Amino acid sequence: SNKISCLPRVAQNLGYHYSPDLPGFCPIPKELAEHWPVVSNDRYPNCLQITLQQVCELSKPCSAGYMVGQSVFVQTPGVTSYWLTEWVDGKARALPDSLFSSGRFETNSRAFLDEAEEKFAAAHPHACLGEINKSTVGGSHFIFSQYLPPLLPADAVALVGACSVVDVYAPSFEPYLHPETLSRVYKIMIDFKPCRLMVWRNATFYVQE
Amino acid sequence: SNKISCLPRVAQNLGYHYSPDLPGFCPIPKELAEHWPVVSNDRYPNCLQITLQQVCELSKPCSAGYMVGQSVFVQTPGVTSYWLTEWVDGKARALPDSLFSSGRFETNSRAFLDEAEEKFAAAHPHACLGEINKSTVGGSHFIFSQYLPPLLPADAVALVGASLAGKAAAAACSVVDVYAPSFEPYLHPETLSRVYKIMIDFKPCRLMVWRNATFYVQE
């Protein structure tokens, strides 16, 4: 039954860690899923439902990297990878808008998603200055950037819940890279982990969390 | 190889995971090692340089576990194993004080380095030897301690379970392979109980000290 799923970090930043059917999460008995927040293709009184088609009006379309069983695929820009439906106490509540990883990291690819992203990286070749660590700023680049090593072991860091590489489809940042003022700090989300974007009106920005 | 290197975790805790010339790290092309923070025997605009002799005023001696190529080596007490030199923008930056692992973890040796450490361990039996308090194990904090499992993971400080089969057991106690007498400058504070902020292999640790009694470590 089309065991489709998001990159686990997405559901886990929503606070869902168990799944009776999906393999990317922790195993929980079918029976116990009726009484615990889980991730699944099916529907439960308290769960995050992942489907290919829309379930209801409050289902969130997500253009992102995704999985089908064990196999992980890469975001196709412009199309929905999976629809997210969050059921609480039986009734579905709305999900917050967020940026999403293309899943290039897990795929071992450093390649651009489309020509539109390639023209972006040419237009803003040195946007995205280092990701702000809690105290002092540390270097960060997009996964396609020329300045990254050929090998990115697990000892680098994506923008993921529980040197910094951002795997997000680059033109997703376009709305934030045009502030009316000279400086502007944005409250956003990457894979449903809350982040602060600190942009300069010229072109660039810093990432936080 | 014939090249020298620290125990890979020492460089990693400093923020260096790539190396164009050293085997114990993730490889990187030399052309890229110019613009990327790396560990190396050579010199780069931003790098941690591991040499056999001093290079600069701000070079740091390390009586520590080291490795030549793939082969790991236990430290020799009082003797420098390697000098560390942190370069940032072609400039040498100072390195914080830190205790260092003897490399006994990875060489699987559990004997004392010398007789000084053995005499130290007997002088502080509650913290080094490992006793059975009742139904739990206490003071099995060094690699030469008693009630430790057959295998210990190579870390700055290792959380392992201790046990005397049938009588006692202690889950998740900290075990370190640091040369024991390196703790002596902390064992005599003005207050009876004192907590120190120290570093093991450049990993921020907390040293709890109870005078003339026991001491342990956390991260």
Using alpha carbons, select from A165, A176, A180, A181 the residue that is nearest to residue A205.
A176
| Angle subtended at Cα B69 by Cα B66 and Cα B75, rounded to the nearest 5 degrees | 15
For residues A119 and A110, give the distance between their C-alpha atoms in angstroms, rounded to a whole number: 16
Compute the nearest-CA separation of A136 from chain B (Å): 13
**B28: distance to nearest CA of chain A, Å?**
6
What span, in angstroms and rounded, lies between the C-alpha atoms of A161 and A150?
Answer: 24
CA A97 vs. chain centroid, Å, equals: 11
| Cβ–Cβ under 8 Å, residues B96 and B15 | no
Q: B-side interface with A, Cβ within 8 Å? A: 12, 15, 17-18, 26-29, 32, 35-36
Between chains, do B26 and A163 touch, taking CB under 8 Å as contact? no
The 8-class DSSP code of residue A43 comes to -
Distances from the Cα of A170 to the Cα of A101, A102, A141, B73, angstroms: 10, 9, 11, 46
Length of chain B: 219
DSSP assignment of B135-170: SSEE---BTT-SS--S----SSEEEEEEEETTTEEE
CA distance B178 to B57: 26
Domain residue ranges in chain A: 1-97, 98-209
Chain A contact set for B12 (CB, 8 A): 155
The answer to whether A149 contacts B12, with C-beta atoms less than 8 Å apart, is no
Nearest CB partner across the interface for B35, out of A147, A151, A156: A147
Return the bridge partners of B162, or none: B170
Is A149 in a helix, a strand, or coil? coil
Which residues in chain B are closer than 8 Å to A150, comparing Cβ atoms? 28-29, 32
- Contact: B15, A155; criterion CB under 8 Å: no
- Chain A residues within 8 Å of chain B (Cβ atoms): 147, 149-151, 153, 155-156, 163
Is residue A99 within 8 A of residue A79, CB to CB? The reply is: no
Q: Are A155 and B12 an interchain contact pair (Cβ–Cβ within 8 Å)?
A: yes
CA A134 to chain B, closest CA, distance in angstroms equals 16
The number of beta carbons lying within 10 Å of the beta carbon of residue A158 is: 20
Instruction: Please name the residues in contact with A150: beta carbons below 8 A apart, sequence gap of 6 or more.
Output: B28, B29, B32
Number of CB pairs, chain A paired with chain B, less than 8 A apart:
21
> Which among A149, A155, A163 has the least Cβ separation from residue B28?
A149
Alpha helices in A57-190 (DSSP H): 104-107, 115-123
In B, which residues are within 8 Å of A151 by CB distance? Answer: 26-28
The CA dihedral of B59, B35, A150, A73, to the nearest 10 degrees, is 110
CB atoms within 10 A of CB A179: 14
Identify residue B89 by its one-letter amino acid code: D
**Enzyme catalytic residues of A:** 126, 141
Contact criterion met (CB below 8 Å) for B181 and B117: yes
- Residue B130's identity, in one-letter code, is G
Q: How far is CA A99 from CA A62, A209, B151, B168, in A?
A: 9, 13, 44, 51
Residues of A in contact with B35 (CB under 8 A): 147
Would you call A150 and B36 a contact, using CB atoms and an 8 Å cutoff?
no
A188: DSSP letter: E
Query: Between chains, do A149 and B26 touch, taking CB under 8 Å as contact?
Result: yes
Start-to-end CA span in chain A (Å): 36
Question: Where is B123: in which H helix or E strand?
Answer: helix B115-123
- B155-181 exposure pattern, b = at least 16 Cβ within 10 A, e = fewer: bbbbebebbbeeebebeebbbbbbbbb
Three-state DSSP state, A12: helix
With contacts defined as CB-CB under 8 Å, which chain B residues touch A153? 17, 26
Q: How far apart are the first and last CA of chain B?
A: 34
Q: Residue A147: its chain B contacts at CB < 8 A? A: 35-36
How many CA atoms lie within 13 Å of B211's alpha carbon, on the beta-carbon side?
7
Q: Are strands A60-62 and B82-88 parallel, antiparallel or unpaired?
A: unpaired
Chain-chain contact of A153 with B17 (C-beta, under 8 angstroms): yes
